[PDB]
Write an enzyme that holds these catalytic residues in place. Structure first.
Site, mmCIF file in Angstrom:
data_model
loop_
_atom_site.group_PDB
_atom_site.id
_atom_site.type_symbol
_atom_site.label_atom_id
_atom_site.label_comp_id
_atom_site.label_asym_id
_atom_site.label_seq_id
_atom_site.Cartn_x
_atom_site.Cartn_y
_atom_site.Cartn_z
ATOM 1 N N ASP A 75 42.654 42.744 38.209
ATOM 2 C CA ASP A 75 43.032 44.122 37.940
ATOM 3 C C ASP A 75 44.321 44.559 38.660
ATOM 4 O O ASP A 75 44.749 45.698 38.491
ATOM 5 C CB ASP A 75 41.866 45.097 38.253
ATOM 6 N N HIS A 76 44.965 43.667 39.416
ATOM 7 C CA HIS A 76 46.232 44.037 40.069
ATOM 8 C C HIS A 76 47.364 43.027 39.859
ATOM 9 O O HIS A 76 48.554 43.396 39.897
ATOM 10 C CB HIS A 76 45.988 44.254 41.567
ATOM 11 N N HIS A 107 44.023 51.339 43.649
ATOM 12 C CA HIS A 107 43.245 52.321 42.892
ATOM 13 C C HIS A 107 43.555 53.684 43.492
ATOM 14 O O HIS A 107 43.153 53.955 44.625
ATOM 15 C CB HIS A 107 41.746 52.022 42.963
ATOM 16 N N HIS A 158 43.651 39.684 42.448
ATOM 17 C CA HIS A 158 42.556 39.820 41.481
ATOM 18 C C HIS A 158 43.092 40.273 40.125
ATOM 19 O O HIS A 158 44.208 40.770 40.038
ATOM 20 C CB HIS A 158 41.495 40.814 41.974
ATOM 21 N N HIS A 204 38.948 42.293 51.527
ATOM 22 C CA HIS A 204 38.664 42.371 50.103
ATOM 23 C C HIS A 204 38.982 41.023 49.432
ATOM 24 O O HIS A 204 38.219 40.540 48.589
ATOM 25 C CB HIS A 204 39.450 43.497 49.437
HETATM 26 C C1 LIG Z 1 38.886 42.221 39.715
HETATM 27 C C2 LIG Z 1 37.951 41.350 40.559
HETATM 28 C C3 LIG Z 1 37.755 40.098 40.207
HETATM 29 C C4 LIG Z 1 36.827 39.211 41.032
HETATM 30 C C5 LIG Z 1 36.225 39.694 42.098
HETATM 31 C C6 LIG Z 1 36.447 41.149 42.512
HETATM 32 C C7 LIG Z 1 37.243 41.909 41.794
HETATM 33 C C8 LIG Z 1 37.501 43.357 42.180
HETATM 34 N N1 LIG Z 1 38.599 43.760 42.851
HETATM 35 C C9 LIG Z 1 38.524 45.142 43.012
HETATM 36 S S1 LIG Z 1 39.776 46.135 43.867
HETATM 37 N N2 LIG Z 1 37.362 45.576 42.422
HETATM 38 N N3 LIG Z 1 36.719 44.476 41.894
HETATM 39 ZN ZN LIG Z 2 39.936 43.041 44.003
HETATM 40 ZN ZN LIG Z 3 40.975 46.588 41.996
#
Ligand SMILES: Cc1ccccc1C1=NC(=S)N=N1
Ligand SMILES: [Zn+2]
Ligand SMILES: [Zn+2]
Ligand SMILES: Cc1ccccc1C1=NC(=S)N=N1
Ligand SMILES: Cc1ccccc1C1=NC(=S)N=N1
Ligand SMILES: Cc1ccccc1C1=NC(=S)N=N1
Ligand SMILES: [Zn+2]
Ligand SMILES: [Zn+2]
Ligand SMILES: [Zn+2]
Ligand SMILES: [Zn+2]
Ligand SMILES: [Zn+2]
Ligand SMILES: [Zn+2]
Lengths: 266, 266, 266, 266
Positions: free
Chosen positions: C87-88, C224, C85, C159
């Site tokens: 954020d990583h 996180h 995703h 996830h």
């Molecule tokens: C970053 C992201 C993009 C699309 C769908 C979900 C997420 C998401 N990943 C996390 S850990 N928290 N939100």
């Molecule tokens: Zn995620």
């Molecule tokens: Zn995340």
């Protein structure tokens, strides 16, 4: 002195390459491949689905049989796969170029397809084919619908990580026919135990036996017809001796267990 | 009845597959491929560069010659290509897996490499190899520098859309040597005129003759050594009879004109 | 009249984007990301490994911290990921271009990475980032070795389909420290039951709780940090309150069960 | 302290995002995009073609206009592109998922499209969109025919390496209309001289001015209508003030020369 070896082509039994005319399985489902490789055509009101294509050189034969069935290249909408090895996905790249067809597969199959079967977990670059891209990625249990006909994916990892069984319900003699196209459960020349490229190989196969055993399964078909006791050359009795999914899974497990014991001994 | 033909392997003259020890071209530049296929190693204080790899089955030979030269898998930073056919880009996918090397190529070469040579403009799926991805896309005239050796790309489209000449400056006896590694200018079995897959093929070859003719070129090297009159088996006289870039370009154009006339006659 | 809406950027809490200096976890393992996003640097005798990179705009910060640790761009050998995703894995494409680094990931993560997080199972094209290619595909339980340090992949689908925990054994105060970097077990805004894009979602999460619970786990880290009760801003006591893998799995299951019941009610 | 900046969304003038009903250009050719972004639908007895899609969020609008025209998702056979930036190729990935459409593009456009516009020569990862794969690679001057409409590709490299003009012949009032859809000739914020990512940029623009000037061109259309003096909001006089290809090319070159001089001065 001594040169490096020539590349070796992927050569197969003649029967694998023997063209046959379309053989009807159910009201909308036909075998259109070779005597010993399955390629299933499902004809819907809204275009056709192909499940597997066989060997790389089978593209023109498939299109010929499709034409015989009244399916023009434009009419082919979707290609699905049992697994992305050369003997079942071989002609997919070429079919995509020559038809309207798009490919749906799981992530593992998509990755292996996209590198044309190279870097195989067990056979490296020994058996490759033209690479192709997937248009849609499916998850375990996800359905795809064409002309009202619903296809369900059942992951059965083992023979390849992305090995899949496809199920759908056709009709025949007025009655529903739950068709199960189950992938290979063989492990030809595989290292089963402690395989660094596939550490959980054994656990995946065992789960896959259970999955195949539980499929909705009035009629079983397999990529190699002999595996489910089909005989595509036997005309009116081609499917007479066909195994149930339960019997197929059991025979495959017995064979696997035998191979595992022989590996331990050798 | 008659089955479909078996797949045919891409087989080549034994000399294309004949291993040779590293042959030094200039202070930093070595031929490390086979007798009849070029694979150039450029060794710098800041890592090594490989230009071409030859046939698919040459990966391990190349790695042995690198080791003999003091280049470990981690030391190989970059792979450049003349063009992305099986007999020059064959082992690139495998080398990427087994070393630190990344691939830089132009868009046309990258796309053909990513297809493993399938859907070739002229040979279709006839000669294919394991697919590989490019890590960097280069533009005409773009430079890449590794350890002070500056490689300049000169597009010379024709044999493939993405055919490239790479030039750089090395030293020998304390004097600069401008090396030109010019791609093939052949058109083996190609339809040249009115080719729907390559409408401007002739105009591209003609521009490419001009480009090759004008390269900075104290020493010409070619993917097939015979094309530039190299004899890698001739030791200290390996490069004695080498053509100039001017002479290579003129010979290629004369051959090309002959082929055009033959094509018109046939 | 009314125009289509403007595209919306992926905006996050400031702390997610707050640079921090490298924070040592064990003899060879450092946190080099932001206050609230993990990016782990493991420095071996034979080059560095990066596990996650955070948000797309973190590339230059990561390289800065790497430089502070004596790791030049050339020294970065391998990038591993928790999940693909934005954020990583956000800065992975850019890191690949600017460093020697190659990416290893499972097939699911590779597919999602290759489309820059578009066509997400739950959020569609709502949160995307620059796409990147995987250099090596890993299977569940497979190991990768760098400078003698062994990293083991543990699949924990949920996830994302390709969610992974990575484990390795470092040292600290003369003793072995089994480090477990476990992926998120959240399902933010997800439809859990009867999700057509993820039919077996619930069964995968439950299996993943069990996997996380059983990890070799002297020290738990998470993408996180707050999820494992890390506080990267708390200096000498940053990891004091850290959860065990068992406690992390249990809390995540309790939360999941709560979300499932609320979904049933709403 | 100061966190890293938030990602910034690619925001545009409202008129770029303003939906409009289909506007007919000739017997088979319709503008179906927004007021200020071109998206051309070509309707034939043998399926439909889309040239450009505009911004990423325009997918559903385009599909509604197709439906209004009688074109269903299955009827869309082909997507062609002017160039692969977010404001013209934005919705291509989504359209491929939701329709039968396949993408034909040149190698340069295919590679940039496959990157979702990341690593742009001039804007890096600044403006990106969902990545998509090409199904067919085209060469300069290559034709694609759909239902008797013949599309010819004319490479006009500059604004992007892969920038293309597409020409075809339609009818109006029983007479032929040679339509030219010429790509942008702008260089917004580009470094033109001595650009290491595009060393021959100026020479390519100059050749592209010449190419555009010579196109078969009864009617000029451009991705940004204002560039050719179209006013899609002006109804029956929408195309009245349209430039010739000659005039468009001359204006672009004059602007270009102005930019060069400004660049030299700055
Ligand atoms: C970053 C992201 C993009 C699309 C769908 C979900 C997420 C998401 N990943 C996390 S850990 N928290 N939100
Ligand atoms: Zn995620
Ligand atoms: Zn995340
Ligand atoms: C066709 C192939 C290529 C590479 C590795 C395995 C195989 C193989 N698949 C089947 S079914 N029988 N052999
Ligand atoms: C190896 C190859 C594959 C497809 C088309 C052409 C060629 C070929 N390249 C050279 S050099 N000589 N033959
Ligand atoms: C949309 C975009 C992305 C990256 C670089 C340039 C551009 C751009 N294309 C046009 S037309 N006007 N600006
Ligand atoms: Zn197989
Ligand atoms: Zn098989
Ligand atoms: Zn060649
Ligand atoms: Zn050759
Ligand atoms: Zn643009
Ligand atoms: Zn634009």
């Amino acid at each position: 002195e001594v040169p490096l070896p020539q590349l070796r082509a992927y050569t197969v039994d003649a029967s694998w390459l023997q063209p046959m005319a379309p053989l009807q399985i159910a009201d909308h489902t036909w075998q259109i491949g070779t005597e010993d490789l399955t390629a299933l055509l499902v004809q819907t009101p809204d275009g056709a689905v192909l499940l597997d294509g066989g060997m790389p050189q089978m593209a023109s034969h498939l299109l010929d049989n499709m034409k015989a069935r009244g399916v023009t290249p434009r009419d082919l909408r979707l290609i699905l796969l049992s697994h992305a090895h050369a003997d079942h996905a071989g002609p997919v790249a070429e079919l995509k170029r020559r038809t309207g067809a798009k490919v749906a597969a799981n992530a593992e199959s998509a990755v292996l397809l996209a590198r044309g079967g190279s870097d195989d977990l067990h056979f490296g670059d020994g058996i490759t084919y033209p690479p192709a891209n997937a248009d849609r990625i499916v998850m375990d249990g996800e359905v795809i619908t064409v002309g009202g006909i619903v296809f369900t994916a059942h992951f059965m990892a083992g023979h390849t990580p992305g090995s899949t069984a496809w199920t759908w319900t056709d009709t025949r003699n007025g009655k529903p026919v739950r068709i199960a196209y189950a992938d290979s459960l063989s492990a030809p020349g595989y290292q089963l135990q402690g395989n660094p490229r596939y550490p959980h190989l054994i656990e995946d196969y065992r789960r896959s036996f259970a999955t195949v055993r539980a499929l909705p399964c009035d009629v079983l078909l397999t990529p190699h017809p002999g595996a489910s006791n089909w005989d595509y050359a036997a005309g009116a009795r081609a499917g007479a001796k066909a195994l149930t999914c339960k019997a197929y899974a059991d025979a495959a497990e017995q064979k696997f267990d035998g191979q595992l014991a022989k590996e331990t001994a050798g």
